[PDB]
Design a protein around this ligand. Sequence first.
Ligand SMILES: CC1=N[C@@H]2[C@@H](O)[C@H](O)[C@@H](CO)O[C@@H]2S1
Length: 323
Amino acid sequence: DQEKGITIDISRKHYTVETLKSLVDEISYNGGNYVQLHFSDNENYAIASEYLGQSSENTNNTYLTKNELLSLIAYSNDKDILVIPDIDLPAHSKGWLELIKKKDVKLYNDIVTDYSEETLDYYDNRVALDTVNQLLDEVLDLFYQPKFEGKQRIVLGGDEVSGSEVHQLDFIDFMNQIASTVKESKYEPQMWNDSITSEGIANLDDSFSILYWQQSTLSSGEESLNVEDFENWGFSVYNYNAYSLYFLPSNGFTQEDINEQMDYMNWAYAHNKFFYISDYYHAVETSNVKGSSLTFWGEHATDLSQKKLLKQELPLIRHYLNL
Ligand SMILES: CC1=N[C@@H]2[C@@H](O)[C@H](O)[C@@H](CO)O[C@@H]2S1
């Protein structure tokens, strides 16, 4: 059994709870297993947080209200859909850091890297970890789903982490700490593949499953880890193929563009065809593949209405889930 999931960037692009409910409808209709809610990135933190000071119980253009989010999860669970929270650490973090800035400038200066406003100081900084751990406790609580007790998961990010190649062991140790927090609440931790190196893989908690989206190149020009490599060190992977399984909804796109996307997916997509440097659709023969996901990234969706978002996403969801 392979899982199939949809991942929705609700950070770079605002989504009503109704749009998300209709998306989950389509996921359930076609026998999908999960939806991944990428709600924290540089542009915005798009759910409600006591801890960060997003409390309004009223609908708004910034974040899902607590009850909105909780309604969405209850809805998804009723359709046998697991909701997987996705909070991006330690980079892609400007959104909630700006919230910490406004809440407590002193704490902000104690946890932000000296060089990036998007990156939390993962370089062995205790107060950075403590802040994150509190934010994670709130998030683990919000996404509690008793129907999926003992199968819940959370994406902790780990993608595009500046400094992580050179300072690999600090990256890994940080990822292990936040892994530890979430295992405390019985979730399985997950992260993107891209910032983990040969140096780091031996120290990484193998409780992590990996979201394999694109094989990285080291600064030497050498090839970074592939799925076999991850298999060799005990890591399960999921195919998030950056070509076949990524799509950026855009105002410019018509019906014919969506038709072309579906014709492309017909040949480009398979459950086990990952994006390797050499072959963008590389068939892999390992035993560590657990599923796949189509992902809607939000950063081209600037001028899309809720309706036009549905019009683009709904058919791609259906096509992917039936391939
Ligand atoms: C994981 C990934 N991190 C990036 C996202 O943050 C961007 O939205 C998009 C690039 O345009 O895809 C890559 S994949």
